[PDB]
């Protein structure tokens, strides 16, 4: 499923505009909290990649094939912050349980 996951990654289409998975996941409250927890350089890179995504979608264009992001180099930068925020939310929920 390395090849199948690569095929599904290419067929999803967000690699064509130069996004990332953590770039393109929808902003819930936990996601915005973890984005606030993102460091300066990662936040700036995220916002520039989103701005380029908006520009390309406005122009109905995509990045060149060499400039497409690849499955091998898709960093998951927002993931540990998201898991920590989810853990904090679950801990608050179980304290509200008790």
């Amino acid at each position: 499923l390395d090849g199948f996951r690569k095929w599904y990654y290419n067929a999803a289409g967000f690699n064509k505009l130069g996004l990332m998975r953590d770039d393109t996941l929808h902003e819930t409250e936990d996601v915005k909290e973890a984005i606030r927890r993102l460091p300066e350089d990662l936040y700036n890179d995220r916002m520039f990649r989103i701005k380029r995504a908006l520009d390309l979608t406005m122009r109905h264009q995509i990045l060149p094939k060499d400039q497409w992001t690849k499955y091998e180099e898709d960093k998951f930068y927002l993931e540990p912050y998201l898991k920590e925020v989810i853990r904090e939310r679950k801990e608050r929920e179980e304290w509200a349980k008790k």
Binding site: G13, N44, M47, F48, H60, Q61, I62
Partner: protein, 77 residues
């Protein structure tokens, strides 16, 4: 809310030119045709199979309806 505090953007430079200096239709065909076939190829395999099976169900329903109104050859006598 309004412009000024929508987002925090840093180190981003945008270049734009005037509409009177540039063209309204810059290579409208030589770049428009590859773009439109690119978009059609990218999003053709998610719409065309449902629409063609709608066409098949439509024509099969019409054909079966016409055979249903057709005379039954069982009841010769």
């Amino acid at each position: 809310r309004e412009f000024g505090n929508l987002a925090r953007i840093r180190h981003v430079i945008s270049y734009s030119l005037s509409p009177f200096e540039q063209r309204a239709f810059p290579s409208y065909f030589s770049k428009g045709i590859p773009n439109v076939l690119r978009r059609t190829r990218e999003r053709i395999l998610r719409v065309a199979p449902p629409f063609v099976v709608v066409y098949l169900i439509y024509t099969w329903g019409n054909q079966e309806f016409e055979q249903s109104k057709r005379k039954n050859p069982a009841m010769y006598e």
